[PDB]
Design a protein around this nucleic acid. Structure first.
Ligand code: ARG
Ligand code: MG
Ligand code: MG
Ligand code: MG
Ligand code: MG
Ligand code: MG
Ligand code: MG
Ligand code: MG
Ligand code: MG
Ligand code: MG
Ligand code: MG
Ligand code: MG
Ligand code: MG
Ligand code: MG
Ligand code: MG
Ligand code: MG
Ligand code: MG
Ligand code: MG
Ligand code: MG
Ligand code: MG
Ligand code: MG
Ligand code: MG
Ligand code: MG
Ligand code: MG
Ligand code: MG
Ligand code: MG
Ligand code: MG
Ligand code: MG
Ligand code: MG
Ligand code: MG
Ligand code: MG
Ligand code: MG
Ligand code: MG
Ligand code: MG
Ligand code: MG
Ligand code: MG
Ligand code: MG
Ligand code: MG
Ligand code: MG
Ligand code: MG
Ligand code: MG
Ligand code: MG
Ligand code: MG
Ligand code: MG
Ligand code: MG
Ligand code: MG
Ligand code: MG
Ligand code: MG
Ligand code: MG
Ligand code: MG
Ligand code: MG
Ligand code: MG
Ligand code: MG
Ligand code: MG
Ligand code: MG
Ligand code: MG
Ligand code: MG
Ligand code: MG
Ligand code: MG
Ligand code: MG
Ligand code: MG
Ligand code: MG
Ligand code: MG
Ligand code: MG
Ligand code: MG
Ligand code: MG
Ligand code: MG
Ligand code: MG
Ligand code: MG
Ligand code: MG
Ligand code: MG
Ligand code: MG
Ligand code: MG
Ligand code: MG
Ligand code: MG
Ligand code: MG
Ligand code: MG
Ligand code: MG
Ligand code: MG
Ligand code: MG
Ligand code: MG
Ligand code: MG
Ligand code: MG
Ligand code: MG
Ligand code: MG
Ligand code: MG
Ligand code: MG
Ligand code: MG
Ligand code: MG
Ligand code: MG
Ligand code: MG
Ligand code: MG
Ligand code: MG
Ligand code: MG
Ligand code: MG
Ligand code: MG
Ligand code: MG
Ligand code: MG
Ligand code: MG
Ligand code: MG
Ligand code: MG
Ligand code: MG
Ligand code: MG
Ligand code: MG
Ligand code: MG
Ligand code: MG
Ligand code: MG
Ligand code: MG
Ligand code: MG
Ligand code: MG
Ligand code: MG
Ligand code: MG
Ligand code: MG
Ligand code: MG
Ligand code: MG
Ligand code: MG
Ligand code: MG
Ligand code: MG
Ligand code: MG
Ligand code: MG
Ligand code: MG
Ligand code: MG
Ligand code: MG
Ligand code: MG
Ligand code: MG
Ligand code: MG
Ligand code: MG
Ligand code: MG
Ligand code: MG
Ligand code: MG
Ligand code: MG
Ligand code: MG
Ligand code: MG
Ligand code: MG
Ligand code: MG
Ligand code: MG
Ligand code: MG
Ligand code: MG
Ligand code: MG
Ligand code: MG
Ligand code: MG
Ligand code: MG
Ligand code: MG
Ligand code: MG
Ligand code: MG
Ligand code: MG
Ligand code: MG
Ligand code: MG
Ligand code: MG
Ligand code: MG
Ligand code: MG
Ligand code: MG
Ligand code: MG
Ligand code: MG
Ligand code: MG
Ligand code: MG
Ligand code: MG
Ligand code: MG
Ligand code: MG
Ligand code: MG
Ligand code: MG
Ligand code: MG
Ligand code: MG
Ligand code: MG
Ligand code: MG
Ligand code: MG
Ligand code: MG
Ligand code: MG
Ligand code: MG
Ligand code: MG
Ligand code: MG
Ligand code: MG
Ligand code: MG
Ligand code: MG
Ligand code: MG
Ligand code: MG
Ligand code: MG
Ligand code: MG
Ligand code: MG
Ligand code: MG
Ligand code: MG
Ligand code: MG
Ligand code: MG
Ligand code: MG
Ligand code: MG
Ligand code: MG
Ligand code: MG
Ligand code: MG
Ligand code: MG
Ligand code: MG
Ligand code: MG
Ligand code: MG
Ligand code: MG
Ligand code: MG
Ligand code: MG
Ligand code: MG
Ligand code: MG
Ligand code: MG
Ligand code: MG
Ligand code: MG
Ligand code: MG
Ligand code: MG
Ligand code: MG
Ligand code: MG
Ligand code: MG
Ligand code: MG
Ligand code: MG
Ligand code: MG
Ligand code: MG
Ligand code: MG
Ligand code: MG
Ligand code: MG
Ligand code: MG
Ligand code: MG
Ligand code: MG
Ligand code: MG
Ligand code: MG
Ligand code: MG
Ligand code: MG
Ligand code: MG
Ligand code: MG
Ligand code: MG
Ligand code: MG
Ligand code: MG
Ligand code: MG
Ligand code: MG
Ligand code: MG
Ligand code: MG
Ligand code: MG
Ligand code: MG
Ligand code: MG
Ligand code: MG
Ligand code: MG
Ligand code: MG
Ligand code: MG
Ligand code: MG
Ligand code: MG
Ligand code: MG
Ligand code: MG
Ligand code: MG
Ligand code: MG
Ligand code: MG
Ligand code: MG
Ligand code: MG
Ligand code: MG
Ligand code: MG
Ligand code: MG
Ligand code: MG
Ligand code: MG
Ligand code: MG
Ligand code: MG
Ligand code: MG
Ligand code: MG
Ligand code: MG
Ligand code: MG
Ligand code: MG
Ligand code: MG
Ligand code: MG
Ligand code: MG
Ligand code: MG
Ligand code: MG
Ligand code: MG
Ligand code: MG
Ligand code: MG
Ligand code: MG
Ligand code: MG
Ligand code: MG
Ligand code: MG
Ligand code: MG
Ligand code: MG
Ligand code: MG
Ligand code: MG
Ligand code: MG
Ligand code: MG
Ligand code: MG
Ligand code: MG
Ligand code: MG
Ligand code: MG
Ligand code: MG
Ligand code: MG
Ligand code: MG
Ligand code: MG
Ligand code: MG
Ligand code: MG
Ligand code: MG
Ligand code: MG
Ligand code: MG
Ligand code: MG
Ligand code: MG
Ligand code: MG
Ligand code: MG
Ligand code: MG
Ligand code: MG
Ligand code: MG
Ligand code: MG
Ligand code: MG
Ligand code: MG
Ligand code: MG
Ligand code: MG
Ligand code: MG
Ligand code: MG
Ligand code: MG
Ligand code: MG
Ligand code: MG
Ligand code: MG
Lengths: 116, 149, 64, 202
RNA sequence: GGGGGGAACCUGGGGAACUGAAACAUCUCAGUACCCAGAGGAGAGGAAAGAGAAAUCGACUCCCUGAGUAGCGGCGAGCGA
RNA sequence: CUGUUGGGAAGCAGCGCCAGAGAGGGUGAAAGCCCCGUAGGCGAAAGGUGGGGGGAUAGGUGAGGGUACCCGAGUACCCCGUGGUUCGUGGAGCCAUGGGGGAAUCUGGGCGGACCACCGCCUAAGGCUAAGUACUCCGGGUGACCGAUAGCGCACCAGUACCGUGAGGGAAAGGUGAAAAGAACCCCGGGAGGGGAGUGAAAUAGAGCCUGAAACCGUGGGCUUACAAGCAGUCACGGCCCCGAGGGGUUGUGGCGUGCCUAUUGAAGCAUGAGCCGGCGACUCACGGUCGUGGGCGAGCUUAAGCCGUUGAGGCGGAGGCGUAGGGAAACCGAGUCCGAACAGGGCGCAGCGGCCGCAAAGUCCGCGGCCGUGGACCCGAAACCGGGC
RNA sequence: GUGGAGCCUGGGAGUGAGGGCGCGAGCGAUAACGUCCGCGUCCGAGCGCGGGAACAACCGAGACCGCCAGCUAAGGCCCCC
RNA sequence: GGAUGACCCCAGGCGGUAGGGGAGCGUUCCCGAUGCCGAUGAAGGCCGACCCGCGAGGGCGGCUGGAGGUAAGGGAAGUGC
RNA sequence: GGGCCUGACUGCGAGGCCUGCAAGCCGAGCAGGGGCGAAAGCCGGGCCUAGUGAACCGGUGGUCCCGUGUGGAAGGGCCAU
């Protein structure tokens, strides 16, 4: 029996093109350019999931640094103090406290100065 | 038991290896042939059993031995096949070439020679020849060796 | 079509009962005058072909 | 070994035969594979680049046209060209071992006997070649047509009467085969047919 | 009576080369492709100046087998009763 | 047959019936019973055939005894040159014959692989001879054959159009609908085309007609864009729009970020290839081998061609093959054998699990799979070589 | 020393253009992104990740997937960062 | 563990070119099938932010389309660009 | 340097070195018949490592293994070169 392509290739090309919706020019219209665009897209997504974790830690740290310097110490001193005090609140929540709960953060700062 | 139950045992019918059908398969593109050279080509190499890259071959450097014959060919002479006493153990009474042929012991067109392996049985065995030991054992066991011409 | 027997092998080599491949030692066809009796004598025996070469030669003898 | 019901004017008698205790599904499969394979026509065919109608001419020069190199338009790379490794007329038959198919035959009958789906009969009453007659007889025999039946008899008149029924497959005992047994829910045999069968598997 | 035609098939008269031998000349391809003559629903072959070792067989043709055997061979590649 | 849904029933429902016929194709959809058929039967005045049956005819036919008349000539035979055969000069016979020489008639002659002897076989130099075998223009039957880029080059007005001086090359192009009911008539327009009306179950089924993908072009809408540096994405956040602790679209800013494939030590690479999209496009098959594997049987396993049966039925067939013993160039011997003086030494060889039972196994057969050999052997591509023609 | 260690039999390969770096030599000119060997390494195949401005083979480190969690490596902590 | 691919628990491995091996998806065709799905709408087409699957894919729903399609389990290839 | 000599043996060969193959290398010991020596013993060429060439085809000596119906013969095999 003969088994011609028939339906199969069109359906595969459609899967790819649907994923490429939104892409510029031929990157969303041509199967070939869509597929190339997607290769890169997937690698970026993987790399940037990893990178997103670093991106946010850097942001927290910057905010934490600014909140600390309002109370007369820098970030690196503040983190040492927290360590000596045994306080384990992470940078994500430190940064939140620094903005949403300035009294609590100021309290944390005291403990950190004292612990040293 | 019906048709929808008829099934081969695991392993009885296995899938073929299909090459040049894509990256995921493990056999795409070069189709397990590697890169370039004669072996990758349609038609491939010279006979690997013999050819050695142009150098005089392992086979051809060995010497010939023996009579190879000549036209007009094979000289017709009577041929013997040996059957051991042990192989005769299954029979009763008289054993002959035709019986051993039929039993699948003796090949057609071969004269019958009895050989000494195993134990003799009191049988009248009819044959074209006997080894010395076959002759000894058959006498001792009470059998009657009959020698053809 | 069925494999043909290689006659060059069939004339040089034998497959023993256990599937070894045996040939005549090389090097005594001629130039023998200054070869010691030990050399001549030992070259007059059969020898067992190394495994990789034996397998190749066996494949040339499909009906032995 | 097995107890097989026999239909008689004297009533539901009983018969015993040494059909194999053990049923080997894989072997049964191998017999049906062989049966279905050797009946293949193997008439699929295509044309090779050497067998297609075009000329062997090089369609344009090797170099300097600015196009891809080509020989003749029969090459499989061309639309309308030869086909690569297409089917050619082929014999799918092979010789399945005699003992395997004899064994298969015995096992197939054994499977039906183990289920109580094997029935033997002495005669077929009043069926003289009319379907309506076989139907009447079948009803009394417990064959209401809710189950497919492989009817094995040497009586031509019986086979003619039953053959057009959707639920009936008809065979002379010389034709008993495991595909037809396994196809059908019930096995119905002549005492005569049962006999040539026992000769066949002996 | 002949002449000319007919898709293959057939017999006869002629008869390559690429290729293979990892070069090449003997050898291979192959008595193939092809040209020609003739035949017919077929054609050829056929009633032993046979075989060849069986004290044997009994025209010829064709299929299985014998057998990739016997042998042949720059005893190479291969060829092959 | 009726009812029912439907444009339409063959669907569904009720109640039946045929079947040596429930192969299959149709009919408005899916029908054993409406149609064409199918099973089973029937049929030729004319012409063809007639291998079967019957009948003519041609032809067919003894025994010894003697006689030595006849028994295929430029032949046998020998030599020279060559072909055929498995035989390539080989110890080279046999069969054929271009050249030279050149017999005999059975007490004649050819052959059994130089030759000679013995022992056999056979009857050359005249001719014919069914059948079993090959093929497929033609008719038919059937496909785990194709389904309009497939299948023949051609489903269609194709060996055509067209190309070529010519030999020769050689396409593309199938489908409205159940039914033409193929849209009267009116309206804009020179027409084309359209808008109404009308037909239709359906008219983006309207003939440029089934379905109607993709590239590609356009109209409308949402978001967005004129201080911005870019393999075009991705991660985050915010804005707006949409669908209703959520999601979809869009993208302002910030982070990160060197296409795909090929070939390479090394490519984003300024190395190859690709305009884009759709369709065609490359590891197969036969036979043999070698391993592995699923089964069958096991010192045995197995049949080939055929023959009978079947008409998607299987069986018979043991010829033969592999295995059961090896060693030796061989004669030959044999659980051994070869080298040798050896009873020396060495090479190559030689010996199941459980309570008669089971089980397992040599081996072998079949299926399957990997790989190898032979074929074009994964596909495409030369420059060339040869033959016959133009 | 129990390791994707080792040995034995068999099936299937691919590879037989390497390249940088460190060390040891030869050749070269105590030249070459040079060349040819040796021991090692990495790239090749880790052009995946951090550092080195950028950069196959230098330093750090062997990426099964997910996380808006933590600790470190080399390298860094004036701003770009 | 439990006895056997029943599922759970603890542990360790899981970068990768040539290449080896394993397990699957889908396409055409056969058996299953005188069946079954189908005009209350087959195949094919277009959507989908939904469900299952690691994935190749498979469902389901809306629209189109208007007559075919074909299960569990197996078989065979002109089988995936 | 001298005496006597021919082991510059025949038939084998445990065991190794080397090594992709094929080769190449060393070899105690047993038997046959020897040489030298009172003997123990040594002797299967040369202090050692180069002085060489696989197959095929063919020559010569021997052997008496095959001998195409049989006896021979032709021609081959085997051993040596
Ligand atoms: N003798 C027989 N019944 N043969 C088998 C049946 C024949 C035919 N194929 C049928 O089914 O009608
Ligand atoms: Mg395709
Ligand atoms: Mg298609
Ligand atoms: Mg498609
Ligand atoms: Mg695709
Ligand atoms: Mg689609
Ligand atoms: Mg798809
Ligand atoms: Mg976008
Ligand atoms: Mg676009
Ligand atoms: Mg587009
Ligand atoms: Mg992707
Ligand atoms: Mg990630
Ligand atoms: Mg990253
Ligand atoms: Mg981290
Ligand atoms: Mg400060
Ligand atoms: Mg710390
Ligand atoms: Mg901490
Ligand atoms: Mg298969
Ligand atoms: Mg295969
Ligand atoms: Mg696999
Ligand atoms: Mg596949
Ligand atoms: Mg793949
Ligand atoms: Mg694999
Ligand atoms: Mg790979
Ligand atoms: Mg590729
Ligand atoms: Mg390749
Ligand atoms: Mg491979
Ligand atoms: Mg492979
Ligand atoms: Mg390969
Ligand atoms: Mg390659
Ligand atoms: Mg390469
Ligand atoms: Mg390579
Ligand atoms: Mg390549
Ligand atoms: Mg290369
Ligand atoms: Mg190359
Ligand atoms: Mg290669
Ligand atoms: Mg190539
Ligand atoms: Mg090719
Ligand atoms: Mg080649
Ligand atoms: Mg050379
Ligand atoms: Mg021989
Ligand atoms: Mg002959
Ligand atoms: Mg007796
Ligand atoms: Mg040879
Ligand atoms: Mg030699
Ligand atoms: Mg010699
Ligand atoms: Mg010397
Ligand atoms: Mg010597
Ligand atoms: Mg000597
Ligand atoms: Mg000797
Ligand atoms: Mg044989
Ligand atoms: Mg044998
Ligand atoms: Mg078929
Ligand atoms: Mg076929
Ligand atoms: Mg074709
Ligand atoms: Mg064809
Ligand atoms: Mg062609
Ligand atoms: Mg052609
Ligand atoms: Mg052609
Ligand atoms: Mg043509
Ligand atoms: Mg042509
Ligand atoms: Mg041509
Ligand atoms: Mg041509
Ligand atoms: Mg040409
Ligand atoms: Mg060209
Ligand atoms: Mg060019
Ligand atoms: Mg161009
Ligand atoms: Mg081109
Ligand atoms: Mg071009
Ligand atoms: Mg071409
Ligand atoms: Mg061509
Ligand atoms: Mg062509
Ligand atoms: Mg064309
Ligand atoms: Mg075609
Ligand atoms: Mg093709
Ligand atoms: Mg091909
Ligand atoms: Mg081709
Ligand atoms: Mg055929
Ligand atoms: Mg097969
Ligand atoms: Mg067959
Ligand atoms: Mg039927
Ligand atoms: Mg029926
Ligand atoms: Mg049925
Ligand atoms: Mg039936
Ligand atoms: Mg004429
Ligand atoms: Mg004529
Ligand atoms: Mg001729
Ligand atoms: Mg003539
Ligand atoms: Mg000729
Ligand atoms: Mg001719
Ligand atoms: Mg010529
Ligand atoms: Mg030539
Ligand atoms: Mg060729
Ligand atoms: Mg060839
Ligand atoms: Mg070749
Ligand atoms: Mg050549
Ligand atoms: Mg060549
Ligand atoms: Mg050349
Ligand atoms: Mg040539
Ligand atoms: Mg020839
Ligand atoms: Mg021809
Ligand atoms: Mg004619
Ligand atoms: Mg005929
Ligand atoms: Mg004739
Ligand atoms: Mg005559
Ligand atoms: Mg044989
Ligand atoms: Mg020939
Ligand atoms: Mg309707
Ligand atoms: Mg109505
Ligand atoms: Mg009705
Ligand atoms: Mg009804
Ligand atoms: Mg019927
Ligand atoms: Mg029907
Ligand atoms: Mg019908
Ligand atoms: Mg129906
Ligand atoms: Mg239907
Ligand atoms: Mg109907
Ligand atoms: Mg009829
Ligand atoms: Mg009829
Ligand atoms: Mg007479
Ligand atoms: Mg008379
Ligand atoms: Mg006279
Ligand atoms: Mg005469
Ligand atoms: Mg005359
Ligand atoms: Mg002559
Ligand atoms: Mg000749
Ligand atoms: Mg000749
Ligand atoms: Mg010769
Ligand atoms: Mg001759
Ligand atoms: Mg003569
Ligand atoms: Mg003559
Ligand atoms: Mg003459
Ligand atoms: Mg006479
Ligand atoms: Mg005479
Ligand atoms: Mg003569
Ligand atoms: Mg003569
Ligand atoms: Mg003769
Ligand atoms: Mg003779
Ligand atoms: Mg005479
Ligand atoms: Mg004769
Ligand atoms: Mg004639
Ligand atoms: Mg006749
Ligand atoms: Mg005739
Ligand atoms: Mg005939
Ligand atoms: Mg025919
Ligand atoms: Mg026809
Ligand atoms: Mg189709
Ligand atoms: Mg169709
Ligand atoms: Mg078309
Ligand atoms: Mg066409
Ligand atoms: Mg179409
Ligand atoms: Mg075509
Ligand atoms: Mg036609
Ligand atoms: Mg065409
Ligand atoms: Mg056309
Ligand atoms: Mg036309
Ligand atoms: Mg012209
Ligand atoms: Mg013209
Ligand atoms: Mg042309
Ligand atoms: Mg229509
Ligand atoms: Mg129509
Ligand atoms: Mg309709
Ligand atoms: Mg007007
Ligand atoms: Mg007007
Ligand atoms: Mg108008
Ligand atoms: Mg208008
Ligand atoms: Mg209008
Ligand atoms: Mg209307
Ligand atoms: Mg409607
Ligand atoms: Mg509709
Ligand atoms: Mg529409
Ligand atoms: Mg429509
Ligand atoms: Mg239609
Ligand atoms: Mg349309
Ligand atoms: Mg349109
Ligand atoms: Mg717009
Ligand atoms: Mg500015
Ligand atoms: Mg702006
Ligand atoms: Mg961005
Ligand atoms: Mg952010
Ligand atoms: Mg949103
Ligand atoms: Mg977004
Ligand atoms: Mg957003
Ligand atoms: Mg940031
Ligand atoms: Mg870039
Ligand atoms: Mg880069
Ligand atoms: Mg790609
Ligand atoms: Mg490329
Ligand atoms: Mg390149
Ligand atoms: Mg390059
Ligand atoms: Mg380069
Ligand atoms: Mg670039
Ligand atoms: Mg560029
Ligand atoms: Mg360039
Ligand atoms: Mg480029
Ligand atoms: Mg290049
Ligand atoms: Mg272009
Ligand atoms: Mg485009
Ligand atoms: Mg495409
Ligand atoms: Mg393959
Ligand atoms: Mg093929
Ligand atoms: Mg094959
Ligand atoms: Mg195989
Ligand atoms: Mg097997
Ligand atoms: Mg069996
Ligand atoms: Mg049998
Ligand atoms: Mg054979
Ligand atoms: Mg032998
Ligand atoms: Mg001797
Ligand atoms: Mg021994
Ligand atoms: Mg031994
Ligand atoms: Mg067993
Ligand atoms: Mg077995
Ligand atoms: Mg292999
Ligand atoms: Mg070929
Ligand atoms: Mg070719
Ligand atoms: Mg091929
Ligand atoms: Mg191949
Ligand atoms: Mg030219
Ligand atoms: Mg030439
Ligand atoms: Mg030339
Ligand atoms: Mg020339
Ligand atoms: Mg010419
Ligand atoms: Mg282990
Ligand atoms: Mg490992
Ligand atoms: Mg390893
Ligand atoms: Mg493998
Ligand atoms: Mg493999
Ligand atoms: Mg390589
Ligand atoms: Mg290799
Ligand atoms: Mg090389
Ligand atoms: Mg190299
Ligand atoms: Mg290089
Ligand atoms: Mg190097
Ligand atoms: Mg180098
Ligand atoms: Mg270095
Ligand atoms: Mg240093
Ligand atoms: Mg250095
Ligand atoms: Mg150095
Ligand atoms: Mg360098
Ligand atoms: Mg340097
Ligand atoms: Mg240097
Ligand atoms: Mg290195
Ligand atoms: Mg590479
Ligand atoms: Mg690295
Ligand atoms: Mg690495
Ligand atoms: Mg990199
Ligand atoms: Mg990076
Ligand atoms: Mg880096
Ligand atoms: Mg960096
Ligand atoms: Mg940086
Ligand atoms: Mg770098
Ligand atoms: Mg670099
Ligand atoms: Mg790196
Ligand atoms: Mg890892
Ligand atoms: Mg820290
Ligand atoms: Mg540090
Ligand atoms: Mg810095
Ligand atoms: Mg900072
Ligand atoms: Mg991996
Ligand atoms: Mg595995
Ligand atoms: Mg599948
Ligand atoms: Mg698919
Ligand atoms: Mg089909
Ligand atoms: Mg059916
Ligand atoms: Mg159906
Ligand atoms: Mg229904
Ligand atoms: Mg609808
Ligand atoms: Mg379909
Ligand atoms: Mg889907
Ligand atoms: Mg639909
Ligand atoms: Mg239909
Ligand atoms: Mg489907
Ligand atoms: Mg199906
Ligand atoms: Mg299934
Ligand atoms: Mg099945
Ligand atoms: Mg097929
Ligand atoms: Mg294909
Ligand atoms: Mg001295
Ligand atoms: Mg003396
Ligand atoms: Mg040794
Ligand atoms: Mg060695
Ligand atoms: Mg040396
Ligand atoms: Mg002594
Ligand atoms: Mg002595
Ligand atoms: Mg002495
Ligand atoms: Mg003395
Ligand atoms: Mg002494
Ligand atoms: Mg010694
Ligand atoms: Mg010296
Ligand atoms: Mg010396
Ligand atoms: Mg000295
Ligand atoms: Mg030497
Ligand atoms: Mg030599
Ligand atoms: Mg030679
Ligand atoms: Mg010789
Ligand atoms: Mg010689
Ligand atoms: Mg001699
Ligand atoms: Mg003799
Ligand atoms: Mg003789
Ligand atoms: Mg005499
Ligand atoms: Mg004699
Ligand atoms: Mg004499
Ligand atoms: Mg002689
Ligand atoms: Mg010698």
């Amino acid at each position: 029996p003969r088994a011609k392509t028939g339906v199969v290739r069109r359906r595969k090309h459609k899967k790819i093109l649907k994923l490429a919706k939104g892409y510029w020019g031929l990157r969303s219209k041509s199967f070939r350019k869509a597929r190339e665009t997607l290769f890169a897209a997937g690698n970026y997504a993987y790399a940037h999931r990893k990178r997103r974790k670093r991106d946010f830690r850097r942001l927290w740290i910057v905010r934490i640094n600014a909140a600390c310097r309002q109370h007369g110490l820098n970030y690196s001193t503040f983190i040492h103090g927290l360590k000596k005090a045994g306080i384990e609140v992470d940078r994500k929540n430190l940064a939140d406290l620094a903005v949403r709960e300035p009294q609590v953060f100021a309290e944390l700062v005291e403990r950190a100065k004292a612990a040293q | 038991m019906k048709l929808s139950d008829l099934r081969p045992n695991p392993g009885a019918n296995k899938r073929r290896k299909r090459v040049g059908r894509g990256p995921g398969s493990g056999h795409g593109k070069t189709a397990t042939r590697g890169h370039k050279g004669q072996k990758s080509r349609s038609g491939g190499l010279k006979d690997p059993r013999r050819f050695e890259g142009g150098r005089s071959t392992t086979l051809m450097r060995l010497p010939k031995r023996g009579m190879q014959g000549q036209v007009p060919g094979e000289i017709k002479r009577p041929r013997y096949q040996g059957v051991n006493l042990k192989d005769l153990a299954r029979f009763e009474g008289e054993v002959t070439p035709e019986l051993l042929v039929r039993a699948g012991l003796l090949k057609k067109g071969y004269r019958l020679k009895i050989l000494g392996e195993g134990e003799a049985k009191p049988l009248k065995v009819v044959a074209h020849a006997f080894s010395k030991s076959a002759l000894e054992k058959l006498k001792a066991a009470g059998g009657e060796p009959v020698l053809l011409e | 079509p069925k494999m043909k027997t290689h006659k060059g092998a069939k004339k040089r080599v034998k497959i023993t009962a256990s599937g070894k491949v045996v040939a005549m030692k090389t090097g005594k066809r001629h130039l023998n005058w200054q070869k010691s009796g030990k050399e001549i004598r030992q070259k007059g025996r059969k020898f067992v072909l190394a495994k990789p070469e034996a397998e190749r030669i066996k494949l040339l003898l499909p009906y032995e | 070994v097995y107890q097989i019901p026999v239909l008689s004017p004297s009533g539901r008698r009983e018969l015993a035969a040494d059909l194999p205790a053990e049923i080997n599904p894989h072997l049964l499969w191998e017999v049906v594979r062989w049966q279905l394979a050797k009946r293949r026509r193997g008439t699929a065919s295509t044309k090779t680049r050497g067998e297609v109608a075009y000329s062997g001419r090089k369609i344009w020069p090797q170099k300097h046209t600015g196009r891809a190199r080509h020989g003749d338009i029969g090459a499989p790379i061309f639309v309308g060209g030869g086909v690569v490794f297409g089917p050619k007329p082929r014999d799918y038959s092979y010789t399945l071992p005699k003992k395997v198919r004899k064994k298969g035959l015995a096992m197939a009958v054994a499977d039906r006997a183990r289920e109580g789906k094997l029935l033997l009969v002495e005669a077929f009453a009043g069926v003289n070649g009319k379907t309506k007659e076989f139907l009447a007889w079948a009803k009394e025999a417990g064959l209401d047509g809710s189950e497919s039946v492989l009817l094995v008899t040497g009586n031509e008149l019986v086979r003619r009467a039953a053959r057009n029924l959707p639920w009936v497959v008809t065979l002379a005992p010389e034709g008993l085969n495991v595909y037809d047994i396994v196809r059908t829910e019930r096995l119905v045999m002549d005492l005569d047919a049962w006999e040539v069968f026992q000769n066949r598997i002996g």
